[PDB]
Amino acid sequence: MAKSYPTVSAEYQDAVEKARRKLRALIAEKSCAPLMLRLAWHSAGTFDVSSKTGGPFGTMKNPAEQAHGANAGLDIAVRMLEPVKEEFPILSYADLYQLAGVVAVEVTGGPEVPFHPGREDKPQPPPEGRLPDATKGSDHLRQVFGKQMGLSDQDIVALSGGHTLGRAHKERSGFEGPWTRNPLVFDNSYFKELLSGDKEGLLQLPSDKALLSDPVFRPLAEKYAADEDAFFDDYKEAHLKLSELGFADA
Ligand code: HEM
Ligand code: NA
């Protein structure tokens, strides 16, 4: 609910901007924005507010966190981004993975998520099992996002909009296919596909369905389905809170 951002060195700021450009060109070229967003998201979602452990602090680099079940396939993102670290080694992995999320969203047409650099790489990855269970429901979402992460009900619907990008893969999570007809375009189509019900060739996890069966989550999804500026605004807000969990507080 309050931040005090470090002023990083001119050289770090220059690294960040150089990296941002390189991420644009890497991402746009290899069309892997969605997996990049997933890396940022999974790097940050592990934060627990009561224990002040986990969160966007580079730990996704430790091949132990890449071995967490929930994280199958992030090792591809981590290897894809290493050249970027090779050229700007002063950057932390913490910063580099969140900047990739931000750049993913912006390249695919989505809102401008501000970026405040300065995350340190911590040494101890969080414990496995903090991220949300795709087969679970509305109250689980509040346990993960709400009680552990400290985000709000609005953050949950808006953020669940990240599934406007990309798809599931059988070898990673078990589920298969995309949520939307245009998986390389950041728009509000995800909430439109939800409210439309199940259909062939499009995925819907039970955690997706949870948003339609809840009096708070339901109208938010309706709003975002109808109003893409509303969605882009709230998403921008939530993505930014997500990207700084435990970072630069007070
Ligand atoms: C309850 C919350 C969530 C659940 C249960 C969940 C679960 C999943 C699952 C099972 C996949 C498919 C993985 C695979 O086999 O490739 C996936 C993909 C993805 N998730 Fe979520 N996720 C959640 C929240 C989020 C959030 C908050 C974001 C971003 C802000 C996000 C971004 C993505 C993206 C971009 C992909 C596509 C990856 C690709 O195309 O390779 N997810 N998610
Ligand atoms: Na889309």
Residue numbers in the entry: 1 to 250
How is this structure described in the published paper?
APX is a key antioxidant enzyme in higher plants, scavenging H2O2 with ascorbate in several cellular compartments.
Three mutations, C4S, C168A and K229D were selected, which are far from both the heme-binding and ligand-binding pockets. In addition, the construct contained two conservative mutations, E14D and V221A, that were part of the cloned recombinant PviAPX. The electron density of the apo-form PviAPX revealed a metal ion from the early stages of the refinement which was located at the distal side and positioned 13 Å from heme iron. An Na+ ion was placed, since this was the only cation present in our final purification step and crystallization procedures. The Na+ ion was coordinated by the sidechains of Thr-164, Thr-180, Asn-182, Val-185 and Asp-187, all of which are conserved among APXs. Consistent with the spectral signals of the purified mutant and wild-type PviAPX, the apo-form crystal structure showed what was presumably the resting ferric state (Fe(III)). A bound but non-coordinating water molecule was positioned distal to the heme at a distance of 2.2 Å from the iron, which was similar to the observed ferric heme species in rsAPX. The Ne atom of His-42 on the distal side was hydrogen bonded to a water molecule, which in turn hydrogen bonded to the heme-bound water molecule. To further investigate the binding preference of phenylpropanoids, molecular docking was performed with the structural coordinates of the apo-form PviAPX.
